[PDB]
Amino acid sequence: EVETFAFQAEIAQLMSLIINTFYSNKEIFLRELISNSSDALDKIRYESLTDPSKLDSGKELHINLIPNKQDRTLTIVDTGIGMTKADLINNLGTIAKSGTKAFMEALQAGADISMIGQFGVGFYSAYLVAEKVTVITKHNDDEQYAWESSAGGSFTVRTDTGEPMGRGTKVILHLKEDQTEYLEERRIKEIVKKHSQFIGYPITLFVEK
Numbered sequence: 001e002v003e004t005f006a007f008q009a010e011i012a013q014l015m016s017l018i019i020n021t022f023y024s025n026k027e028i029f030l031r032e033l034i035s036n037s038s039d040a041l042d043k044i045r046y047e048s049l050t051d052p053s054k055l056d057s058g059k060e061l062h063i064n065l066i067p068n069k070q071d072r073t074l075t076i077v078d079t080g081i082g083m084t085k086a087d088l089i090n091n092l093g094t095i096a097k098s099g100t101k102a103f104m105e106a107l108q109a110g111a112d113i114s115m116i117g118q119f120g121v122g123f124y125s126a127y128l129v130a131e132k133v134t135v136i137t138k139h140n141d142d143e144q145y146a147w148e149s150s151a152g153g154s155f156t157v158r159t160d161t162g163e164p165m166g167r168g169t170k171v172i173l174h175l176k177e178d179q180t181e182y183l184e185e186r187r188i189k190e191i192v193k194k195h196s197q198f199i200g201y202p203i204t205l206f207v208e209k
C-alpha cells in the first residue's frame with residue numbers, strides 16, 4: 001500500500017532550483033545531512049534526560065556513513081529521534097515552506113546554495129548528488145516508514161517491510177551517474193574532516209569488500 005503525495009509548490013520549486021542551477025560545490029550535501037542527524041540525536045538525548053525509557057529502542061547515539069558501489073548508494077544512518085508518518089508528510093519535520101521563502105530571497109540577495117542549512121531546508125541539498133532519495137525512519141511513537149522521491153513534484157510514503165531499525169533515520173542517496181566520487185573512502189573522509197569535524201557524535205565510515 002503506497003500513498004503518493006504532491007510536494008507543496010514552493011518545495012517543488014526549491015528542488016528544481018537545486019537540480020537545475022549550475023553550482024559546483026556539491027559536497028556540502030553531506031555536511032547538511034550529518035548536521036540534520038546531529039540535530040535528531042540531540043532531540044532524543046534531551047528527551048532521555050527526563051525519561052530514560054526513551055532509549056529502550058536503542059541506547060547508542062551515532063552516525064554511520066555506508067557507501068555501496070554495487071548499488072551506487074550512499075546511506076547516512078543515525079539513531080536520533082526519528083520521524084512519525086505525519087513528520088514525513090510534513091516535509092520531513094521541517095518548516096520547508098517558510099524556509100524556502102527565506103532561502104530564495106537570500107539567493108537573489110548575494111547568498112549561495114551552500115548556505116541552505118541556515119534556512120532549515122538542508123535535507124533537499126541531497127538532490128545535488130542524488131537522482132532518488134529514500135528515507136527510512138522509526139520514531140518511538142509510530143511505526144517504521146519509507147519516504148521516497150525522484151523529484152518531479154511527488155513523493156511516496158509506505159510502511160517499511162525492510163530491516164527493523166529500532167529508532168532513527170536512514171537517508172539512502174541513489175547517486176547520479178557522474179557523482180560516484182562520493183562513494184570513495186578518501187573523498188568521504190576529506191568532506192567529513194573539512195565540514196563536520198565538531199559534530200558531537202561518532203561518525204563511522206564503513207568500508208567495502
Ligand SMILES: CC1(C)C(=O)Nc2ccc(Br)cc21
Nearest residue numbers: 036037040082083092123169
Ligand atoms: C531532516 C532529515 C530528513 C535529514 O536529512 N536527516 C535526518 C535525520 C533525522 C531526522 Br528525525 C530527520 C532528518
